[PDB]
Amino acid sequence: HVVYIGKKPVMNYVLAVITQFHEGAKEVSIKARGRAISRAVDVAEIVRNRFLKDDVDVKEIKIGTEELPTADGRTTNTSTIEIVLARKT
Amino acid sequence: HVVYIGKKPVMNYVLAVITQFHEGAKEVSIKARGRAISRAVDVAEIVRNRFLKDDVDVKEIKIGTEELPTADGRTTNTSTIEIVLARKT
Numbered sequence: 001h002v003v004y005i006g007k008k009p010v011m012n013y014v015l016a017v018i019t020q021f022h023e024g025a026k027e028v029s030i031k032a033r034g035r036a037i038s039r040a041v042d043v044a045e046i047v048r049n050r051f052l053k054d055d056v057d058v059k060e061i062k063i064g065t066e067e068l069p070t071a072d073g074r075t076t077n078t079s080t081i082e083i084v085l086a087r088k089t
Numbered sequence: 090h091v092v093y094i095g096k097k098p099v100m101n102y103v104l105a106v107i108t109q110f111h112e113g114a115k116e117v118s119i120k121a122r123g124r125a126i127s128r129a130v131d132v133a134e135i136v137r138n139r140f141l142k143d144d145v146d147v148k149e150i151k152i153g154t155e156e157l158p159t160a161d162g163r164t165t166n167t168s169t170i171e172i173v174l175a176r177k178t
């Protein structure tokens with residue numbers, strides 16, 4: 001039950017999101033990291049706003065720091081975001 | 090108590106937030122819109138995960154979208170985030 005923001009267009013994911021919601025999913029998670037986090041809030045915004053206002057709330061938002069491997073076997077840090085949209089209760 | 094994420098280097102804003110708490114700030118909000126959001130999360134993470142690991146955490150995170158009167162009689166929407174960090178008591 002999760003849609004990850006990749007290279008595809010923002011509207012490509014609100015599609016994937018609503019699709020899982022259509023297919024039942026009671027909570028769909030919109031995950032992203034790095035600069036793709038802006039596109040993540042984009043998706044969740046267009047969904048709750050433009051398409052599923054009536055019956056879809058933001059259940060919670062949680063952030064974090066993932067780890068990226070560098071040429072030195074050491075690791076960099078990249079912010080991440082998790083937006084869980086749930087069916088309006 | 091607010092720090093808006095502009096273009097400035099990350100650290101300038103993290104340091105900014107910190108200074109706020111350093112003065113007693115019992116809660117600070119890292120706001121950003123558009124492509125900045127991702128950088129709004131960088132900040133909030135670095136603060137609660139590194140420079141203030143022992144005395145500050147995420148009290149809550151908010152999202153939304155806003156109108157921006159632009160070219161001609163047109164308004165553009167942009168996503169917005171308001172990460173709230175509170176003092177650990």
Ligand SMILES: NC(=[NH2+])NCCC[C@H](N)C(=O)O
Pocket residue numbers: 064065066077078079080099130131132134135
């Ligand atoms: N948890 C974090 N995002 N920490 C800071 C890394 C953010 C960004 N990738 C940078 O290095 O500027």
